[PDB]
Structure 1
C-alpha cells in the first residue's frame, strides 16, 4: 500500500495523457502487484512518453567522407608516429589515467543465448569466455605498463549491463573471481530503460501489473555514467582517457595503447576506429561527414543509393566504407559535459514483437506481427555534437581488431566459428612472426602470454602442432 491518494494523482496523470489503460486490471491485483505497478509507472512521465511515441510514429544532406585532417591509419602512418603513440598510450596507462567502459547491455537476439553475450564460449581450446579474454588483455596491459614505470598500473573496468544481463553477469564475474583482476577495480552497473510502445502509441503492458520496458540502447551509456556514480569514480581515480567498446568483439584491443596515445596526442574529445567495409550489405555503421560534422549512418538507416555509391576513379570500391567497429575514445573532460547534451540524443525506432496483455482481455499473448516499437539512443550520436578538429578516426586491420559475434553457430559469418578462427589465425600469425613453426587450424595465444604479439621470442624454433593453446 503506497498510499491511496497518491495512487489517485498518478492515475489522473496517465488518464489525462491517454494512457489510463495501464490501470485496467488494478481491481483484481494483489497488494504486492499493485505496489509494483505504482512504483514503475511513477518512474515514467506519460507526457514525455507521448512526445517520444509521437516523434517515433508520426515522424518528420551534404554527405561526404571524413576529410584527411580528421583521419589516420595504422596501415600507412609514419612508423615514428605509431611508436610514439604506442609509448605515450602506455605511459598514460602506467600513469593510472586510463579507464575502460565495456558495453555489455546487449540481449544477443541474433545469437539466441540464454546467458549474457560476454559469457559465451566460442570453442577455443581454453574455453574462455569473451569477458575473460578481455579481462586478461587488461591484466596483460597493466603488466606491460609496469615494465616502463616500475610501478603498479591500474585500468578500472566499468561494465555496462542491462536489467536482463546484470544479475547473471555479476554472478559469472564473481564465480571467476573477476578473472584475476582486483574486484575493487571492476564496477558493474546498469543502463536505463524506456517503455515499449504499441503501433497506436499506447504503453504496452507486459503483465497486468508491469509495463513492458527495454534497454535504452548503447547511447544510454552517457546518462548511466552519471546516475551509476561511475563518472564520479573516474574523477576520484584521476581518469583522463576512456576506451569504450562492445563486448561482442572477440579481437578487441582493450585500452589499446596506440589508440589512446593517438587520441591524446591530438587532444581530441572523441576518437573512433574503423575498418574497410567488407561489402555493400555488411551490417555496420558508416562513419562519415554529414552536414559538415563527424557522424555515423547506421546500417538500419542507410538507403541503397548511399550504401552502393562508388568511388569516381575506383568503380568497384564503395565511396563510403569506414565501417564502425564500436571502439571509441573519450577525454574525461567530455564526460564532464554530459548534463548539457544527454537529452539531445535522438531515439531510433525499431519495430519489434513485444509479448504483452491484449488491451481489453488480459490474455498474456505472444504476437505474430510487430505490435510495437522499441526506442534506442546510439553511442555515436555525440559525434555531430563534436567539432571536427576535436574528433579523430583511425583505420585498423580487420583481421587483428574486429571479429564480432552476432549470430549462432551454423550461420557462417560473424559467429562463434568465425570468431574462433580469427583468434586462432591471429595466434599462428604472431607465433610465425616470432620464429615459431606451426604444423597443421590455428593457435590460441593467451593474452597473459601476449597482448598484441609481443613476448613470444621464447617460441623461436619450436614446432607447434595446431590446434594448440599457449598459456602460462
Structure 2
C-alpha cells in the first residue's frame, strides 16, 4: 500500500477508537506493515464496535420437549427405528443428503499444533479422526448403492477457520481425500473476528498482527451463504443436512436413522442427545425454555428440576436430553438464513489471550436459532452414547474425553459388533478396531462368525 492508502486506513481505525492497532508501525519491516494493512483492511472497525457494544451492553419456564417431537434408539418401537433407517438410506441413495463438518474450532484444550481432525488417538491403524469419518461416508454411500444400484454421494462440507484451513487442505490432499471424490469434499471457512479487550479494543497478537478467532459455531449459517456452500447444495438438489463437530470420534456420519426420523416429521431442525442418567451430571440440556426449543446450560438447572423423575418412566430423569452438538437441517431451513442470521447474538467468551482471562472472543452459538424455530418444526432423538458420542477434548492424562477414552470407546464398540455377529474375541490383558470400510454401524460382519480374534486387533478391508 501507498503512504496515503495506509493513512486512510489509519484514519478509519482512529476515528473508530481503534487507532492503537497502528501504535508500532514504524518499528515494522516494509513487509510486516503490508501484512498489517491487509489484515486490517478485512475488518470494518465500526462493525466491530457495534458487535462489541451489543455483547458488552446487552426465572425461565423449563419443560421437556413435546412427546410427539421426541424419539429414542433406547425406547422407541424397533419397527419405527427400522423404518427410519430404510427411509434415511433411501434419501442417501437419492443423493439428497449432505454433511457439514464443524472443524473450525481451535481446540485450545487439546493443545495440538495440527487441526483437531488430524489427531491420532492411538488406534492400531493410527487413522486420524478425519480418515475415520471419511470412511464412514464411503461405507454409507456403498450401503446406499445396494438400494439404487448406482453411486450415492454425500458431499462433505468441511468448515474450517483461518488457523485450520491450509493444514486441513494439505492433509486431505496428502491422503488422496480418503478415497472420496475430490469434488465431494468441499473445504470452506467461517468468519473470524478480532479478539477484544474488556473495553472492546482490538487485541494485537504481534506488533503487525491482530489477534483473531472464529466467530463461534453459530457462524455456520452465515458461512454457508458467503462461501457458496448453500448454492452448491441447491445445484446438487440436497434436501437434508447433517452437522456435527469433528471432535466426536464415534460420530455416525449422515446417520440414516437420524435423517429418516427428522424427514418423517418434516422438521426444519432436529437434534441428537444422549441420556443424562444421574441428576448431578453437568450437561447442557435440550428442552423447552419459555416455550421455545433451546439448549440450557446445566448451571441454569436447579436441584428440583435436575432431580425430577419422568412421570411416565419413573426410573428415568424428567430432564435428560444431553446435548451432543449433532444436528439435522432441512434445505428449506437453510433457504431462510437471510431472514434471521443477523438476529444471532454474539456472546462474550472470556479467555486468556496472549498479546502486545484478559480478553474476549465474540461468538455466535449454533443453537441460538432453536428458540426462533416453531415447536412443531423441531425434533429430538436420544441415542446410545457408547455407539454415538465420544468427544476428543483433553490431552492424554486427563481421564475424561481424551485420546484414551476415545480409543477405548471405538475399540470396545468394535469388539461388541464382532461378538454379536458370532466372532470370538480373545483378550490376554482390549477391544478391536473395526474399519468403517468393513462396517458402518455393526452390519456386514457375518464373515467373522466362529473366527477367533486376538485383542487388540484391527479388522480392515
The alignment's TM-score, normalised by the length of structure 2, stands at: 0.94
Distance 1:232-1:283 versus aligned 2 partners, 3 A rule: farther
Question: How much has 1:15 moved relative to structure 2?
Answer: 2.1
Q: Aligned partners of 1:82, 1:307: CA distance in 2, in Å? A: 29
Unaligned runs of 5+ in 1: 358-369
Maintained 8 Å contact 2:272/2:383: yes
Distance 1:214-1:451 versus aligned 2 partners, 3 A rule: same
Which digits, 9 at most, give the CA deviation of each residue in 1:71-130, with x for residues without a partner? Answer: 111112122211111111011100011111111111221111111111111111111111
Distance 1:332-1:282 versus aligned 2 partners, 3 A rule: same
Which digits, 9 at most, give the CA deviation of each residue in 1:385-408, with x for residues without a partner? Answer: 111101100000011111111111
| The 10-residue stretch of structure 1 (375-384 or 29-38) with the greater mean CA deviation from structure 2 | 29-38
Maintained 8 Å contact 1:193/1:213: yes
Question: How much has 1:279 moved relative to structure 2?
Answer: 4.8
Q: Aligned partners of 1:30, 1:157: CA distance in 2, in Å? A: 41
Over the residues paired in the alignment, what is the CA RMSD in angstroms?
2.2
Question: How much has 1:207 moved relative to structure 2?
Answer: 1.9
Corresponding residue number in structure 2 for 1:64: 63
Q: Aligned partners of 1:298, 1:176: CA distance in 2, in Å? A: 39
Q: Aligned partners of 1:9, 1:58: CA distance in 2, in Å? A: 30
Distance 1:346-1:401 versus aligned 2 partners, 3 A rule: same
Maintained 8 Å contact 2:98/2:155: yes
| The 10-residue stretch of structure 1 (390-399 or 72-81) with the greater mean CA deviation from structure 2 | 72-81
Distance 1:60-1:70 versus aligned 2 partners, 3 A rule: closer
How do residues 17-416 of structure 1 correspond to structure 2 at under 5 angstroms?
17-59=16-58, 61-277=60-276, 279=278, 284-298=283-297, 319-357=318-356, 370-416=357-403
Which digits, 9 at most, give the CA deviation of each residue in 1:361-414, with x for residues without a partner? Answer: xxxxxxxxx221111111111111111101100000011111111111111111
Q: Aligned partners of 2:281, 2:195: CA distance in 1, in Å? A: 28
Q: Aligned partners of 1:468, 1:92: CA distance in 2, in Å? A: 34
Which digits, 9 at most, give the CA deviation of each residue in 1:127-181, with x for residues without a partner? Answer: 1111111011000000000011111101111111111111111111111111111
Q: Aligned partners of 1:299, 1:178: CA distance in 2, in Å? A: 39
Maintained 8 Å contact 1:284/1:325: no
Distance 1:165-1:306 versus aligned 2 partners, 3 A rule: farther
Question: How much has 1:312 moved relative to structure 2?
Answer: 8.1
Question: How much has 1:52 moved relative to structure 2?
Answer: 2.5
SS of structure 1 residue aligned to 2:143: helix
Question: How much has 1:39 moved relative to structure 2?
Answer: 2.8
Maintained 8 Å contact 2:97/2:154: yes
Maintained 8 Å contact 2:277/2:316: no
Distance 1:51-1:25 versus aligned 2 partners, 3 A rule: same
SS of structure 2 residue aligned to 1:294: strand
Distance 1:406-1:278 versus aligned 2 partners, 3 A rule: farther
Distance 1:300-1:265 versus aligned 2 partners, 3 A rule: same
Distance 1:299-1:212 versus aligned 2 partners, 3 A rule: farther
Alignment length (residue pairs): 459
Distance 1:372-1:280 versus aligned 2 partners, 3 A rule: farther
Q: Aligned partners of 1:305, 1:277: CA distance in 2, in Å? A: 15
